Design a protein around this nucleic acid. Sequence first.
RNA 1: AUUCCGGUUGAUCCUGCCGGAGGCCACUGCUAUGGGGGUCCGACUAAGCCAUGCGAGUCAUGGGGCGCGCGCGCGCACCGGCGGACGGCUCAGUAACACGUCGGUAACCUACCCUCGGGAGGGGGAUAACCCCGGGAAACUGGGGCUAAUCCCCCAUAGGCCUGAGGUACUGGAAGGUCCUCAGGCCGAAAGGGGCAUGCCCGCCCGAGGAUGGGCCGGCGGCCGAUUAGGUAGUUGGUGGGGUAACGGCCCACCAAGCCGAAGAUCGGUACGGGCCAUGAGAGUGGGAGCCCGGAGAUGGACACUGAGACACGGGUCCAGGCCCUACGGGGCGCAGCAGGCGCGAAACCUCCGCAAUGCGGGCAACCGCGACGGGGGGACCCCCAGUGCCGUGGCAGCCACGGCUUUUCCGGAGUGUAAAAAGCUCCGGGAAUAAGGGCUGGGCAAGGCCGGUGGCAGCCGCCGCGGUAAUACCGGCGGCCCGAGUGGUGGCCGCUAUUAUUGGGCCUAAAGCGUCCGUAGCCGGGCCCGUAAGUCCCUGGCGAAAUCCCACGGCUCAACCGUGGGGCUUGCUGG
RNA 2: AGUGGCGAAGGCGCCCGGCUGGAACGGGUCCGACGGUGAGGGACGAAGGCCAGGGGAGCGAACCGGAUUAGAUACCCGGGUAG
RNA 3: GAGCCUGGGCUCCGUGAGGGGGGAGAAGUCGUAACAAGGUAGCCGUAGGGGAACCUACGGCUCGAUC
RNA 4: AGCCGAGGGAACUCGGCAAAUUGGCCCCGUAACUUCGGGAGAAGGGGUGCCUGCGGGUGUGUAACCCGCAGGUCGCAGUGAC
RNA 5: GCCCUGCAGCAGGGGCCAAGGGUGGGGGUGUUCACCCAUUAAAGGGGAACGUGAGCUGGGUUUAGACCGUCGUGAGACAGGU
Lengths: 174, 96, 241, 125
Amino acid sequence: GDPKRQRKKYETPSHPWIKERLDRERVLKRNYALKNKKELWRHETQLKEFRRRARRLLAARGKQAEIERQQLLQRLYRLGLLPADAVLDDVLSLTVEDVLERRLQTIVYRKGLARTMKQARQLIVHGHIEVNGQVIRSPGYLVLREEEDTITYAKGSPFAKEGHPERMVIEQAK
Amino acid sequence: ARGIVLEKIAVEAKQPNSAMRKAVRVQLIKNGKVVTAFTPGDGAINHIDEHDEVIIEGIGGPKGGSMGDIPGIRYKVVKVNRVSLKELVKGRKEKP
Amino acid sequence: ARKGPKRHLKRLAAPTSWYIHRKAYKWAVRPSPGPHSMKTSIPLIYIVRDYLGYAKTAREARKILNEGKILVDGRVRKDYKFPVGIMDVVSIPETGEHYRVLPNRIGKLILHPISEEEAKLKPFRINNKRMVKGAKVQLNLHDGSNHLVSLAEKDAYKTSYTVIMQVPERQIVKVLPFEVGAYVFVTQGKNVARKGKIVEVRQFPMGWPDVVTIEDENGELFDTLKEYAFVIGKDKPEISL
Amino acid sequence: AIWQGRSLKKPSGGRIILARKKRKRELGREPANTKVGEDREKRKIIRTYGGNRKVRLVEALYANVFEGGKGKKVKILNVVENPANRQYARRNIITKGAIIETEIGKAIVTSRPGQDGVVNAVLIK
RNA sequence: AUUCCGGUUGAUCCUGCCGGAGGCCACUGCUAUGGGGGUCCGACUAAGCCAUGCGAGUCAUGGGGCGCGCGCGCGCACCGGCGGACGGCUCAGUAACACGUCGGUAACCUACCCUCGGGAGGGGGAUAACCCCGGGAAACUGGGGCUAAUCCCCCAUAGGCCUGAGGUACUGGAAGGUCCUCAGGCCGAAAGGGGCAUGCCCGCCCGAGGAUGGGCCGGCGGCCGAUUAGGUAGUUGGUGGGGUAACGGCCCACCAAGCCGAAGAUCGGUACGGGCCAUGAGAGUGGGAGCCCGGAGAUGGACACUGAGACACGGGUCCAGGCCCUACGGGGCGCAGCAGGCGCGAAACCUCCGCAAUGCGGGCAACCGCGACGGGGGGACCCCCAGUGCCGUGGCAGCCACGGCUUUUCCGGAGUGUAAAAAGCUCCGGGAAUAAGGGCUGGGCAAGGCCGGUGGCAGCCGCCGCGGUAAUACCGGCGGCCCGAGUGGUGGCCGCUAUUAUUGGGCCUAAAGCGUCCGUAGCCGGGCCCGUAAGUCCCUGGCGAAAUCCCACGGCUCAACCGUGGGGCUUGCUGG
RNA sequence: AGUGGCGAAGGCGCCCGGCUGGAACGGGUCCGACGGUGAGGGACGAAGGCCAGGGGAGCGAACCGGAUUAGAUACCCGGGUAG
RNA sequence: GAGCCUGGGCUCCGUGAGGGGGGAGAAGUCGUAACAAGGUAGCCGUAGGGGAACCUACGGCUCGAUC
RNA sequence: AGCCGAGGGAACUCGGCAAAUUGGCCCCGUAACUUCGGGAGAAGGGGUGCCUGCGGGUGUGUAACCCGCAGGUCGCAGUGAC
RNA sequence: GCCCUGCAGCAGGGGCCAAGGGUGGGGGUGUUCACCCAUUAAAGGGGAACGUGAGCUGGGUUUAGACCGUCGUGAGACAGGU
């Protein structure tokens, strides 16, 4: 026999040089300030996994089937991609932009803690951003629904003072 | 695979092309069998000499075989005395 | 090639009846031969260290064991390899703690806390019978232990009955037979840890074991084997489950 | 050495290639040809697999003859009519199933002396 | 993503093959900042050869004795006891009851362990250490004297085994079994020792059973070859015996003529078997070094001793073939153990620290030992998360000038961490500074109709095809596109391929109907009625180790990873 | 004499007589699924060729001659062996 | 029951005077057999003959043109 | 006209002339090639005495002729010479 | 045993005296000679009725038998072979 080897968590396209895919991925990379295509591809893989689980469970009879259905719906509600009164057909209308909106970089931008996505990435990586209580340095953390309101500046950080030059330059936008 | 050079030669290109392709006969060290290998690059034959050890790859072709307009040759030179031909031909390294 | 018996055991190869981490290390304590089987027992050091948490290493456990601070069936046990099994009693008199060993509906062994009164009784299942010299009857029980009885009272002991005994001194009290209204506790199989009353027995030809049907107090019926049906009471239990 | 472990041919008639050595468990021993004695009796002792004991008779003088529950210890004269090999009657070699003469009469051996150390026989009617 | 694109013609539609474009494994060129986790690293050729050091010991509470200090305490060796048959390495051989699964032993063995029931009576002996004298180059080894034991021997009693005649108490589905009585016989136990103390701890022998571990048997299941067609002669069975722990042609004596085979025997080739893995929408194709379970081997081959267990990797004997020491008389060795070396090759690491954790052996215990195990060192082994700056103003088309900010990373330090360290984590000081390349640029296929050189030479090229004086296709320069701490080259497998087609291909003309008929096995088979219930269907009991796979929750910053639980996998077997 | 007919196919044309195989039509006749295809095996199978024996008109491979041709081991002409 | 020797069977490899045909390769010699009725319509089978493509005879096919 | 000859073994000679080797019976096993009848006793190998016994075939047969096996023992040698 | 040298030594070349001793074994061929091998101090050439058949052998050659090739109408021949 042959033993186990750890496998990738992202997929690559079938052809590397198709104009439409290139254009779309270019636009997304630019507008969400990503470093590579690996990140885009692994978010897309998350989506595809959700979508395959739904396709499988749909019309499957038993008990484990309904258990897994409810598990999936609750997981999505917790991540923040679906409301509570949702159904198994609302999954197939999801897109990748939602998975892209559920990451720290984007949330830190949409919340007014940073002027740009690159600035938000720098903050996260240098350790100025806090979650409920913690310091996380991974701009692809996939923030949950109960934490989106506990995101602030860290106690030990110059930005945590209201009179910091750069924090004033940031508040000058709003 | 690895072998030792015995003879430097030139082969005719097939029709409707006109050119000489530079090659060498190589006597392998595993089994002693003699084969022929093409020297790629502009001037790669001058960075070679008899009794030099050289490493041999496949040339790249249909069914692990002859490629393009030089049939009869299945192999290709990669390294000369433990240095690479690409570097020797670009001018970045030297043959000891 | 192997020239003899085994003396080690790896953690990925340990039985499923154990609560153990299999990837943390490579080696596990191989039990020594003893009363119960390997698929039905767990050593003592795992109890002292991983279940109750009175020690973090094995030196400490050996040290408490070599001082008589732990009993099993009213007896002192100093061997960290001794196998503990079902219906057995673990007693710490320095902490006033008494536990009874039983399985789950999953098949794993646990510790059910009991009282000092019920800690002095242990049920046994008669597994076979023999006639030995002096014309005496020897009952072979389910933990591999044995009891002697006279010929005059041979018809009262059969091969599936249950016997309650004071544990250290090993004196009998309150035999319990195998009938069509007796209480039961399943010990192995798919329906392990269930409980109910007997309804029907069934026999088969040429080597295949006998089957028994049982009814739980919710009213549902289920079958299993007759050697897996431990008898613990007539209408209600005598021990705590 | 007496292997006594396995056959090197299949019933179809094909050949077999031993994939391993000859183990020690599989081995056997050479036979005791229990003879009628002249002066004494001879017994060997043998250690065995699990640390156990076997007793071999080599020479015999006395037999235990039974007639309906009553046993007598008598002597062994010429051996007669061993139905297992022609030469055994001549060599006066005793086996199970052999017919022997005693001071009383003819008797059949019901024991295995190479395994037990005694010759027990039943008298003929 | 259940996918297509280029190539036979002056142009067209087909068949059919070659190539591209995706993924995984091994070698390799250029280039390279930092962490974490993990079942990664002399497997492919040579199961080829090995210099040095380590890889298996422990008990002083079994016994006598020597030395050092105050009968006591410390230490050394000797006799004695248990262990060394596990663990660790490798894939040569093996097409086999070797492996997997279901069953069986009413045909068998088992030291360490548990329960119960019973015993420890009476005598004897030697011999190591110690002292005298030694021999031999060594390796090894002789004589004499003195002594002890949980050392050895002997009597007895228990008990063990065989047979014959009876009784029927037990188990079981079923007694060549167990129990009772009688009779005739062979073998034949034990250490009341040691310690504390004024009874407790550790122990010795017998029996009945279990557990642990093994031996043997059976049904089912899983490669290729007919340019391999007949093979077998203890071969197939029976009667009687020997031998084994035990059944058995396992072996022997005698009587017979059977056993396997076209549904492919025998022979030959390759190959450790599975859980698993890679790929694919799936059916399916291919592989089975690393972790687990099983098997086999220790330079080739054969044979034995001791022991519960071996025909014994670090114990023995011989032959063959290799090497070493020698005072030439004689002696010794085989890394497929950890490191290290030579050789072979395209192809694989430090002659490091520790028994603190997990475990094994020994020991009443305290505890000692372990290249197993754990911990670091080297390596583009696999996976996860990041970096090589950000902001604002202005000028251009991502860059530059200017003005400020931050410190992941870098430099230095204090704690914690750790067996000790290191790394990692918390804090402090300095400072944008300490850190992008590789392939491509005619079409397929994303991206230059720009400039200089070469001039059918030199060279490119998976395929089509460029190059013969204005080369978008060579070489270079400047620009541009793909991926990105990685990117390219060679070889192998799956897919592409409905080019192996059960799902799901084709045979007038492109590859392809036997020249035509009759028929054996085999496959396919008309309509109604009654029965059985073998296939098939449903419900349920007992099995198909764990890891691996899917899901949710929780613990390491999230993750990779680990844990709890719920499902599948285990291509299935079996009782109703 | 047919674009025709019989035959499993190969193949079968003067007339009369004898022996023999198979198919179609018609049929309130008989049996009662006895059937299809057929690995391996078998039977038939143009011309030419071989063996053994007979026969031998015409035609005619090989062969020999005359022409034609740059040549002509051929096409055309005259003879001829096997068949 | 090793090793040694001897004979036999199966099987793999290396080599050898001389000869045989196959496949590629700028440009050579002799002919002109196939495509048009290709200048004697072509091709299957059997046999004989010839420097070579090829030619003839017997039986067949049309994948043969003109009337 | 005959018998033996150490160590070597055709170096003798036109030439292995002359001499020597093998040799009966039972069992095992036997090639190329072939006109499928042969080759073929191919080749190559093992065994073989005396004594004490046990069995089988035909037969009425402790008349007669034949066929298999065990054990014991002696010798340099068992178709012991021919 | 000596003399000359285009004789350093080891050797070679050329010549004088000397006939006491030695000058062998094998391969193909009927051979003599000639050729070849391995050794050796070297492996000389000739005469004696081409020494030696009232000493041997008997391969070759020159009878009587037969085969092939050439020559000849033929009978037959060949200083041609077997």
